[PDB]
Design a binder for these strands. Structure first.
Lengths: 258, 123, 222, 51
RNA sequence: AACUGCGAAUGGCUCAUUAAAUCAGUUAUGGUUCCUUUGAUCACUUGGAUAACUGUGGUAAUUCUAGAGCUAAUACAUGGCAUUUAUCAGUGGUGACUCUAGAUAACCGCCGAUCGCACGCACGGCGACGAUACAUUCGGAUGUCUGCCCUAUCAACUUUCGAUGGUACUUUCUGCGCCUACCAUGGUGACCACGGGUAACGGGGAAUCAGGGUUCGAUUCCGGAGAGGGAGCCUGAGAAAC
């Protein structure tokens, strides 16, 4: 209470990490970085709990310290790096490239991508300000400050940057008709086409999204991440893009695959 | 009689290893030791038993079958770097120093009193 | 009262016990600042002048400069103050200190030879001891000798003779610090290189953004 | 309770083992039971070495 | 070994205090502070001190220290913006700026004397460390709405010496009777104020239950509080810290 907390209990850990109980008392507290604590996936969980490349936290550090893992092109040696949404985890030693994108269950699924991909990443603009000497700036969702952006880029659009240079390559404006992946709970991981935006002055703007199968659902503006222009996503989507099959439909697909 | 399955093999080129869950079938035997499993796993993967590290064999109720985990390294040098010191101690590789952890805190708290090069004369 | 005398010129020091209190009557009113003559101490100290540098009382508490008293007091000693060593950053422990005024109720009185007299003490002035450590900084060597900006300090190193019994003799030299090496010139050159890369990237990012606004304003003008 | 009954190659020692349909046709003696194909118990082996 | 840097403000333990307080849901900082992480932004190779070490010591005693002789720095020190007001105009903004930028008049820190690797062509690659007018993360701090047990054998309470509001400061990381000075005489209450009790930390929860409920929650998670009792401070981004 006298300062910043540096521990995290497993019971208090984010649920989408899928941590068990009887392994330990503490959960890996993600270090400060681009993404928030509740909205990230530390590098130790992705290598050990997801990819099974390591069995203990010590084996995770033996991998990160050999400089084999690059988040968004840059090597990271901290095993508790946030590595949140849209981040690219490239492993040159095994020639594997990942991109953290939520599934229909609202969890960071193992989404392998190609070598032609993993060179760019999509970022949502969160703040636009004019620096000194009349230089406009930009704030993405992963703490990337961009100088001299396109004047058409606004506080809610999605830009496309290049991991080698960090410069904006393209941008998708926020309007009715574009794809989006909800990232705000109870719809986390659902992908659909924006159909309507309710503007509430002084409150949270509620948008309405429609899936490809016709499922309609609403969420908040801060949870919308524009994915593509129209209905074509600019990224590779995992299996079960955003349909979010009901509990009755998931049972049918489960026993039919037997 | 004694067989090996390795039903969850994994390459894992990051640690120069070979991860797999080893299933041993021993109907009349008693939880086949590591020395017999390692030498039987070496001929299965055409390697030497000096770079095979097996652990965590839990025999199921009723007997006849046990499951564990195995590690096969590319070389003995990569094993000494990535394998924990306690599994190397199970072999003739690593020798843990008998330091008596309770006594380590004693020498430390005694050195916290004197200052300078006299700490070496404490312990 | 014991007397801890030290000779800074020769680097020697010795402890002597003065039983005859008549010799110490000169010190019983001098603070820890004055340089007084050691003539009453005996015929050996004729022409010597000693400076009161400190001392301990009969209980071991050291004399603190500036207290302006002859009795023990308790002061809140912070970092930087003498007679105190902080165990933690920002710690201030109130300790008892002896005043700077020299009295008869002192165990040892520290004295510093500021002027050599006529005779010499065998254990205090006759013997000598080297400095045991030569200069390490590059400029300290140039000031020790008459070296100018053109001479090489690598040649004018101490290189003390380090030889013990039972091993091979060798010579040990300190690492010259603050030296103008070919490596430190590369860092200064690379620091300038990065200063020009930022200047190069600012004029490009400002030009491409000006060219973007230029071609875009021509569209909306019509 | 004497480790004789097995369910599809698993020696089950609990009498309250609720048997489902797919596990009912696989109830048999254990492969190490004197009733099944195994060495006879210590009583048979001790009474045999006597006479 | 020691100097320097950083941590020691997390954890762990307890439930004493505390009854619109804590706490929970909601939410506001456009009234704020944030080490670190992340992205942006960026030669006279100078000066003199010090520890370790060497040596002389004191005290019955301490993780007490004194005196002298040395010697290092990413220690110490040297070698247009930012900062404080005033004026003018209206680049990107927000539901709404006294917003962000710009132009004037001035006022008065920052702008690398560091380190490693690779060694090639006076120029050179890859890093480490370091600066913050910025963003970002971890989050603090204080507010908005609503919600607590028993008690009238507690019916009026607050207001000298702030109670409620206004004005101007002062102060604080900021808004605010937080404080000061001058005015106003208010503010709260049978819809239960104020006062008292709690063998009262609050909540997520537990037990028992047809429905409805009753009772419990010191106790592993979250938040708060305390380190014998109070009070006052140092250092630091962060403590009224044990």
């Amino acid at each position: 209470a006298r300062g910043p907390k540096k521990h995290l209990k497993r019971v208090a850990a984010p649920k989408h990490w899928m941590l068990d109980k009887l392994t330990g008392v503490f959960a890996p507290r993600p270090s400060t970085g681009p993404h928030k604590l509740r909205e990230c996936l530390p590098l130790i969980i992705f290598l050990r709990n997801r990819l099974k490349y390591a069995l203990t936290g010590d084996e995770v550090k033996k991998i990160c310290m050999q400089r084999f893992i690059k988040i968004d092109g840059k090597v990271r040696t901290d095993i508790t790096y946030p590595a949140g949404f849209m981040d690219v985890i490239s492993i040159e030693k095994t020639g594997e490239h990942f991109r953290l994108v939520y599934d229909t269950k609202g969890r960071f699924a193992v989404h392998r991508i190609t070598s032609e991909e993993a060179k760019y990443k999509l970022c949502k603009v969160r703040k636009t300000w004019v620096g000194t000497k009349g230089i406009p700036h930009l704030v993405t969702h992963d703490a990337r400050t961009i100088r001299y952006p396109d004047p058409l880029i606004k506080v809610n659009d999605t830009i496309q940057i290049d991991l080698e240079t960090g410069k904006i390559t393209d941008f998708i404006k926020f309007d009715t008709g574009n794809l989006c992946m909800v990232t705000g709970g109870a719809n986390l991981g659902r992908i659909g086409v924006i159909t309507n935006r309710e503007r509430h002055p002084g409150s949270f703007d509620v948008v309405h999204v429609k899936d490809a199968n016709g499922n309609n659902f609403a969420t908040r503006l801060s949870n919308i991440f524009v994915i593509g222009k129209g209905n074509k996503p600019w990224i590779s989507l995992p299996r079960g893009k955003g349909i979010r099959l009901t509990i009755a439909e998931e049972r049918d697909k489960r026993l039919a695959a037997k | 009689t004694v067989t090996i399955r390795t039903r969850k093999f994994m390459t894992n080129r990051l640690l120069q290893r070979k991860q797999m869950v080893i299933d041993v079938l021993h109907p009349g035997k008693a939880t086949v030791p590591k020395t017999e499993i390692r030498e039987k796993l070496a001929k299965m993967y055409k390697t030497t038993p000096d770079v095979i590290f097996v652990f965590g064999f839990r025999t199921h109720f009723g007997g006849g079958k046990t499951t564990g985990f195995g590690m096969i390294y590319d070389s003995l040098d990569y094993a000494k770097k990535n394998e924990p010191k306690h599994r190397l101690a199970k072999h003739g590789l690593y020798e843990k120093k008998k330091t008596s952890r309770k006594q380590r805190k004693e020498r430390k708290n005694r050195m916290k009193k004197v200052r300078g090069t006299a700490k070496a004369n404490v312990g | 009262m014991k007397l801890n005398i030290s000779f800074p010129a020769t680097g020697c020091q010795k402890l002597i016990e003065v039983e005859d209190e008549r010799k110490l009557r000169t010190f019983y009113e001098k603070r820890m600042a004055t340089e007084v003559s050691a003539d009453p101490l005996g015929d050996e100290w004729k022409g010597y002048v000693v400076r009161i540098s400190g001392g301990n009382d009969k209980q071991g508490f050291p004399m603190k400069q500036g207290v302006l008293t002859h009795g023990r007091v308790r002061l809140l000693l912070s970092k930087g103050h003498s007679c105190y060593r902080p165990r933690r950053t920002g710690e201030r422990k109130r300790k008892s200190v002896r005043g700077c005024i020299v009295d008869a109720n002192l165990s040892v009185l520290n004295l510093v030879i500021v002027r050599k007299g006529e005779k010499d003490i065998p254990g205090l002035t006759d013997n000598t001891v080297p400095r045991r450590l030569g200069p390490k900084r590059a400029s300290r060597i140039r000031k020790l000798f008459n070296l100018s900006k053109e001479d090489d300090v690598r040649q004018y190193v101490v290189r003390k003779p380090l030889s013990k019994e039972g091993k091979k003799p060798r010579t040990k030299a300190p690492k010259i610090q603050r030296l103008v090496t070919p490596r430190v010139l590369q860092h200064k050159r690379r620091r300038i290189a990065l200063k020009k890369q930022r200047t190069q990237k600012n004029k490009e990012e400002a030009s491409e953004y000006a060219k973007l606004l230029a071609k875009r304003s021509k569209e909306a003008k019509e | 309770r004497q480790r004789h009954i097995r369910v599809r190659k698993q020696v089950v020692n609990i009498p309250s083992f609720i048997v489902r349909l797919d596990s009912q046709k696989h109830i048999d003696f254990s492969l190490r039971s004197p009733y099944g194909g195994g060495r006879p118990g210590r009583v048979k082996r001790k009474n045999a070495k006597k006479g």
